[PDB]
Design a protein around this ligand. Structure first.
Ligand SMILES: *[C@@H]1O[C@H](CO)[C@@H](O[C@@H]2O[C@H](CO)[C@@H](O[C@@H]3O[C@H](CO)[C@@H](O)[C@H](O[C@H]4O[C@H](CO)[C@@H](O)[C@H](O)[C@@H]4O)[C@@H]3O)[C@H](O)[C@H]2NC(C)=O)[C@H](O)[C@H]1NC(C)=O
Ligand SMILES: *[C@@H]1O[C@H](CO)[C@@H](O[C@@H]2O[C@H](CO)[C@@H](O[C@@H]3O[C@H](CO)[C@@H](O)[C@H](O[C@H]4O[C@H](CO)[C@@H](O)[C@H](O)[C@@H]4O)[C@@H]3O)[C@H](O)[C@H]2NC(C)=O)[C@H](O)[C@H]1NC(C)=O
Ligand SMILES: *[C@@H]1O[C@H](CO)[C@@H](O[C@@H]2O[C@H](CO)[C@@H](O)[C@H](O)[C@H]2NC(C)=O)[C@H](O)[C@H]1NC(C)=O
Ligand SMILES: *[C@@H]1O[C@H](CO)[C@@H](O[C@@H]2O[C@H](CO)[C@@H](O)[C@H](O)[C@H]2NC(C)=O)[C@H](O)[C@H]1NC(C)=O
Ligand SMILES: *[C@@H]1O[C@H](CO)[C@@H](O[C@@H]2O[C@H](CO)[C@@H](O)[C@H](O)[C@H]2NC(C)=O)[C@H](O)[C@H]1NC(C)=O
Ligand SMILES: *[C@@H]1O[C@H](CO)[C@@H](O[C@@H]2O[C@H](CO)[C@@H](O)[C@H](O)[C@H]2NC(C)=O)[C@H](O)[C@H]1NC(C)=O
Ligand SMILES: CSCC[C@H](NC(=O)[C@H](CC(=O)O)NC(C)=O)C(=O)O
Ligand SMILES: CSCC[C@H](NC(=O)[C@H](CC(=O)O)NC(C)=O)C(=O)O
Ligand SMILES: *[C@@H]1O[C@H](CO)[C@@H](O)[C@H](O)[C@H]1NC(C)=O
Ligand SMILES: *[C@@H]1O[C@H](CO)[C@@H](O)[C@H](O)[C@H]1NC(C)=O
Ligand SMILES: *[C@@H]1O[C@H](CO)[C@@H](O)[C@H](O)[C@H]1NC(C)=O
Ligand SMILES: *[C@@H]1O[C@H](CO)[C@@H](O)[C@H](O)[C@H]1NC(C)=O
Ligand SMILES: *[C@@H]1O[C@H](CO)[C@@H](O)[C@H](O)[C@H]1NC(C)=O
Ligand SMILES: *[C@@H]1O[C@H](CO)[C@@H](O)[C@H](O)[C@H]1NC(C)=O
Ligand SMILES: [Ca+2]
Ligand SMILES: [Ca+2]
Ligand SMILES: [Cl-]
Ligand SMILES: [Cl-]
Ligand SMILES: [Zn+2]
Ligand SMILES: [Zn+2]
Ligand SMILES: [Zn+2]
Ligand SMILES: [Zn+2]
Lengths: 690, 690
């Protein structure tokens, strides 16, 4: 037979290992020749694996690179103007790669140029809460200051956005060992920990889903008319540079001014963690000077797009996509995902060569420039938005297959919960102690649901990966899965030069069994979405979560009972809509269970496909036109995290500080109306059609 | 058989006459009890005619009414402050209706209150060109002036918008006999001409497709959160009132200042048509005083929505809709349309009672509050936008079936051109001299196409009627048809109390043969759209017009050859996209002609259905978020008229006057890119799907 078991059995750990090795021997930075070379290899393959068509889709987008002959660095400068300490010009390369060409040194992508001189303030994680506390509680002024912040907890851009609106002037990001050095583990190359010379790269844009900063709304094709830099989307206005903890130590050791308010503000370095501003008297006259010469440049990028045409519904698309571009070698991010995609395509192609085709079309994508703002996936989705709107069944992401070796992690729409539960009950656990048990069993034991006994945790989609445009802008049901760490104990080498094939093969997954398990989950999800007669979505699972999210937003509002009395703020409409959704979804499920009348079947499959679509508001969220999903958006305080009912959540956020409470509570009421309406409208897509 | 001929043969002129009489005996102003009573009657039915379901959909929207105990009027006031002449408090009622209650007197809906005092300037038609000429050529200052404008040529709001931005202060609209008195025809009741006491009502909002001014984007349901009046959409900021030509004569006869620049500025009254400002010396010290006490009030409105469920594709909707609310009796506008809809439903229902159902679902709508800004159709579309997005095949409008008795008028998307040609070749001409000839033949002879021999004129859809939200916001293929006048020789009694059953029965259509012909066209279009196995759209007809529109926009730009050289303004991308659309549409038509594989058939029908949808830009047009169709929008200078490539057209408009030509031509280039991209993206929806 050609069934899912045949597809799954064909996947091999040894192939994924080969690929990973194949994809990680040289750097594949977006917009470079090496990454174009890899795109052409993958295109070739995907063709030989058996796909019907494999094309490159190219765009010309804004990228950012250091100047090769004028390197970025940070100095401590005395009152004479002498530079008495310099941060590193590069991370010490890993063993055997100390002659690899074109390792681009650590930098913050899209930093402007500048050489700002000043005094440090230490802002902990640079979280919204961290800046409130500094200013409101400690009455500390970030204005005119160079802010030094440790990485962690939230997306770095959000840190930079936070630093900007606090008035800083120049920004230094560093990796504190408290956050990136696991206790009792050796640093690379002898273990998977971050050494003091390692540095986390990463872009610091705040794009809010726009994609290429010069062409918001439209693909960056060969006739595109571009915004000027001054009008670009999401660019930071102050210089920014990242460093490792050896260099941070040398910068922090002199901090004066106020003590840290508490132990949650102290990292692990042997320094005071004083918030500043400025140094201590001996060195009160020394300053910190940044030197940033990176340039933004419009550069061609290339997605590989493979098609396996469906036998019965070729105009319905199930998409498996993940990025290919890396900061350096990409041993985990993204090649541990890309190698899994490659083996998935190989397996589908083996079935295809035997005469099989999926019911629906499967599209496979190798996205470019994800590291510079999800640019490749976003421009492609902009180009193809009408086809994806009307034909897109689901998107399964495929960035890193691993970020630990403890258990499964799944983030997805509630419409895929039942699919994931059923699939994982049929897969073998790769975990020690669970041999002969299901993946569902190991996962449920290690990552219990907060809400239900005997079920596993499944998280919300936010942003920070290539599902963003599909889910949050277009409203196509999306999911992702990977192996993860035990959150009761990022990953330390994230976006550093030390992310290598050896890191994975020696320390994370020597037998490639976790990679294989992830391939079975991602590939199995794609198989069911593309082959099941009835789409494998359960609308009742959305009804359950919508009640949870309504309870939670109401609870936030109920912190302000006087104002809700004064401004007649009622959530009755939203609960009514959720109750209606629950009722209608229950009746739809009954019809689905007990309706070869392929029209009632295409009808009901279209109702399932367009249900995620119904949560889109074509007006977007306030000042964020490309975040259109009314139930989920990336948190306005952390792009990585999903927020439920974001429009109401943001309207309530810090509302007690708003100067005009009448206007502010009016806006909460407006967001309640929009959310209640959207939930009712989505519910009504599941009613009998006439 | 139950085929189209059976449907058509069942339609009867005598029923349409009965319904018309039934719908026009009392006023049916939006938001009044009489119009709710009529809604309930139509609901009852439409149920007894055989529809599967018939419901009222109600909303609470902003309406505008005069104050019953403080009537609106205009005065000439002397230097003593004595009111020496007053305009009428009402139009003399027509014979036999001089005891009808609740005729609301002439007013401009949504006028603010005020009693502004000042001097007149006469602004011809108040067109954009009319104000350029006044200010730029004649150097006349409209600031602080009461503007008196004649109606005609463009939608009145656009006049009011134009007057506002010129700085006026108070506005008087009047009907000049040059525009509303047909030579050699008697005035009502002895002919169809406008008497000197007749007045054209009408709203003066500039909503740009928003619908209810308080709830843009969302239906005005029972939990809606409303904008404050100060933030409402489209409200005028200066008082406005309409008058007849007897009263205008008394206001114009004293005008001084500059002569009219030319004979296109002179109407037919026995006055100078002096542009002013102010009166002549004898009466230099007299002023004009407005007294406006109308109030805006949130008021419930009711649409009737009837469903005839499809036998095979119940989740595909073909909509026949037209409004029910009238200014007074609505003898032409809208009851000549509503009576045709009523007889269409009756005919479909007779087939239904015999066991027939259409292939697709037909929805029938009696819209409310169209006269106050297309409010009923727009709120309903907002409420149901997801269902209409994904399921809407076509919308056929049904306001007035007649505005003359000369020939057919059709305005529709190019996707319906072939449908209309084929249908009219099968219908009998009702015209004198064409007995035994086809409607296509009479129509083609009387209204030749400018472009092709042996074909009839078909116009572009703009706005000013209830197709607007469906076509211009949602991108559902739309059309309208009615009998019209000979444009080589509005209608005079438009929006006056004299629009009665007798007007129609005595003067426009005594045998109800033109009404019957229109019923056959509108009903025949609905029948084919709802029953044809393959949707009756020809994508090649769009390819033809897109080339015409590209040629025309390029020609406008080419008035500025130096600037196109300087700013490298190329239309190459748009012509390339149009060429591609032509090629792909030709190949799609081949596949359509020669593909009982119902999936290739649902696939290809979805490609046809979503082709109009592909011309929507989810970002809308600049500052007009609810006008989203990239090919057509209502003209920014006349809501009634459709404009092609509106985004580029508006970017080029009066560009020679822009202060920063670099920025302005940059914006033309941006609009070219958006249009080329949209045309290519629409083309690509017709490519093979995988
Ligand atoms: C969840 O689904 C239910 C359907 O089961 C749906 O119930 C609807 O609720 C609305 C709002 O409460 C009802 O609206 C009423 O409609 C009647 C006519 O049928 C009107 O007369 C009512 O207006 C009067 O009363 C109001 C409230 O006191 C006054 O404000 C108003 O001025 C009038 O005096 C009112 O509009 C509607 O009938 C039902 N529909 C049903 C039962 O079918 C509910 O709205 C859904 N939830 C959401 C969020 O959509
Ligand atoms: C109408 O349909 C046709 C398809 O039949 C489509 O043609 C496409 O045109 C684009 C733009 O001209 C072509 O783009 C080229 O792609 C190649 C790779 O295949 C690149 O190497 C090219 O870039 C080089 O040259 C450019 C121009 O001088 C430089 O600006 C650039 O820096 C590079 O040096 C270029 O991007 C594309 O190949 C074809 N596709 C085909 C033939 O299949 C056309 O675009 C469609 N019209 C619209 C409006 O979409
Ligand atoms: C990654 O694998 C690819 C595919 O096997 C290798 O590319 C092939 O290399 C051989 C030998 O140079 C060529 O003859 C083939 O034409 C290549 N095939 C392609 C590009 O599709 C590539 O060498 C491997 N890379 C590494 C670093 O091992
Ligand atoms: C997950 O598996 C369950 C259990 O088999 C599926 O639920 C069953 O579905 C069949 C077919 O509709 C029904 O006959 C049973 O009554 C269902 N059992 C239940 C609900 O306990 C479920 O549909 C699967 N989910 C998918 C495929 O998304
Ligand atoms: C318009 O026609 C309707 C439908 O025939 C008339 O309403 C009916 O009137 C009779 C007599 O009053 C009632 O018994 C019916 O119940 C009504 N039917 C309805 C409302 O569906 C109505 O009277 C006519 N109006 C005019 C002005 O002639
Ligand atoms: C309008 O009528 C024409 C003439 O019958 C239709 O065009 C024909 O369509 C049939 C079926 O696809 C083809 O076999 C013929 O070759 C066509 N004749 C032509 C193009 O001259 C046309 O499709 C009709 N338009 C509709 C139904 O929208
Ligand atoms: C906002 S565009 C940059 C996105 C980029 N994303 C990442 O680095 C993702 C985040 C995640 O999904 O775990 N990394 C991986 C290993 O998946 C970043 O955060 O730098
Ligand atoms: C912009 S909302 C008001 C719309 C209203 N429309 C009209 O009056 C329409 C215009 C048309 O489509 O011929 N009149 C009729 C007889 O169709 C008006 O212009 O007053
Ligand atoms: C890199 O730096 C040097 C010094 O400014 C300069 O010569 C060269 O142009 C720079 N390259 C850029 C800005 O791309
Ligand atoms: C911090 O001090 C600077 C001195 O230039 C001042 O301008 C600024 O307002 C202060 N910061 C805040 C947040 O008030
Ligand atoms: C792999 O799992 C083991 C056992 O729990 C643990 O000691 C080791 O640190 C894990 N490796 C990584 C990279 O997490
Ligand atoms: C109508 O006019 C009179 C005078 O202002 C007033 O008594 C009444 O309130 C008005 N009605 C309104 C404003 O609805
Ligand atoms: C017309 O005159 C008034 C006098 O108050 C003046 O303020 C205004 O600027 C003039 N109009 C224009 C268009 O300049
Ligand atoms: C009806 O048609 C006749 C003949 O052309 C014409 O004389 C008459 O004015 C028309 N009536 C109307 C209302 O246009
Ligand atoms: Ca873009
Ligand atoms: Ca509204
Ligand atoms: Cl992922
Ligand atoms: Cl019409
Ligand atoms: Zn990644
Ligand atoms: Zn990354
Ligand atoms: Zn009308
Ligand atoms: Zn009207």
């Amino acid at each position: 037979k050609h069934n899912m078991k045949a597809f799954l059995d064909e996947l091999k750990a040894e192939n994924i290992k080969k690929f990973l090795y194949n994809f990680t021997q040289i750097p594949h930075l977006a917009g470079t020749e090496q990454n174009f070379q890899l795109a052409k290899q993958i295109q070739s393959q995907w063709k030989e694996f058996g796909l019907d068509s494999v094309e490159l889709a190219h765009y010309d987008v804004l990228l950012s690179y250091p100047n090769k002959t004028h390197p970025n660095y940070i100095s401590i400068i005395n009152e004479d103007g002498n530079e008495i300490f310099n941060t590193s010009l590069f991370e010490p390369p890993p063993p055997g790669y100390e002659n690899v060409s074109d390792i681009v040194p650590p930098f913050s992508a899209f930093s402007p140029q500048g050489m700002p001189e000043g005094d440090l303030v230490y802002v902990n994680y640079a979280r919204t809460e961290d800046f409130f506390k500094l200013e409101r509680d400690m009455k500390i002024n970030c204005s005119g200051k160079i802010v030094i912040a440790r990485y962690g907890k939230v997306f770095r851009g959000n840190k930079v956005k936070n630093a900007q609106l606090a008035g800083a002037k120049g920004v230094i990001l560093y990796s504190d060992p408290a956050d990136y050095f696991a206790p009792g583990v050796k640093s690379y190359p002898d273990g998977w920990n971050l050494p003091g010379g390692g540095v986390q790269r990463g872009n610091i844009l705040n794009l809010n889903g726009a994609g290429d900063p010069l062409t918001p709304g439209y693909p960056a094709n060969e006739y595109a008319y571009r915004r000027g830099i001054a009008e670009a989307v999401g660019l930071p206005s102050i210089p920014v540079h990242p460093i490792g903890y050896y260099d941070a130590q040398k910068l922090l050791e002199k901090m004066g001014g106020s003590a840290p308010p508490d132990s949650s503000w102290r990292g692990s370095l042997k320094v005071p963690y004083n918030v500043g501003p400025g140094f201590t008297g001996n060195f009160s006259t020394q300053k910190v000077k940044m030197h940033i010469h990176s340039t933004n440049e419009v550069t061609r990028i290339y997605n590989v797009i493979g098609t396996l045409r469906g036998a019965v519904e070729p105009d319905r698309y199930v998409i498996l996509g993940g990025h290919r571009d890396s900061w350096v070698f990409g041993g985990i991010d993204p090649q541990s995902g890309a190698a899994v995609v490659h083996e998935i395509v190989r397996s589908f192609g083996t079935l295809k060569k035997e005469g099989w085709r999926p019911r629906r079309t499967i599209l496979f994508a190798s996205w470019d420039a994800a590291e510079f703002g999800l640019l490749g996936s976003t421009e492609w989705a902009e180009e193809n938005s009408r086809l994806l709107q009307e034909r897109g069944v689901a998107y399964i992401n495929a960035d890193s297959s691993i970020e630990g070796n403890y258990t499964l992690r799944v983030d997805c729409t509630p419409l895929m919960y039942s699919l994931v539960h059923n699939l994982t009950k049929e897969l073998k656990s790769p975990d020690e102690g669970f041999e002969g048990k299901s993946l569902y069993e190991s996962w449920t034991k290690k990552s219990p649901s907060p809400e239900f006994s005997g079920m596993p945790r499944i998280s919300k989609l936010g942003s920070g990966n290539d599902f963003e445009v599909f889910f949050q802008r277009l409203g196509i049901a999306s999911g992702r899965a990977r192996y993860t760490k035990n959150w009761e104990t990022g990953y330390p080498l994230y976006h550093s030069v030390y992310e290598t094939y050896e890191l994975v093969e020696k320390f994370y997954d020597p037998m490639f069994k976790y990679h294989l398990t992830v391939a079975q989950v991602r590939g199995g999800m794609v198989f069911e979405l593309a082959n099941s007669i009835v789409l494998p979505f359960d609308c009742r699972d959305y009804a359950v979560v919508l009640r949870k999210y309504a309870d939670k937003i109401y609870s936030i509002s109920m912190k302000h009972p006087q104002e809700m009395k004064t401004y007649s703020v009622s959530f009755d409409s939203l609960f009514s809509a959720v109750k209606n959704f629950t009722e209608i979804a229950s009746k739809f499920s009954e019809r689905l269970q007990d309706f070869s009348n392929p029209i009632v079947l295409r009808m009901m499959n279209d109702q399932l496909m367009f249900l995620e679509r119904a949560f889109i508001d074509p007006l977007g969220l306030p000042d964020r036109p490309f975040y259109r999903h009314v139930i989920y958006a990336p948190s306005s305080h952390n792009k990585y995290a999903g927020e439920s009912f974001p429009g109401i959540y943001d309207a309530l956020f810090d509302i007690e500080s708003k100067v005009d409470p009448s206007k502010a509570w009016g806006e909460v009421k407006r967001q309640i109306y929009v959310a209640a309406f959207t939930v009712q409208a989505a519910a009504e897509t599941l009613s009998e059609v006439a």
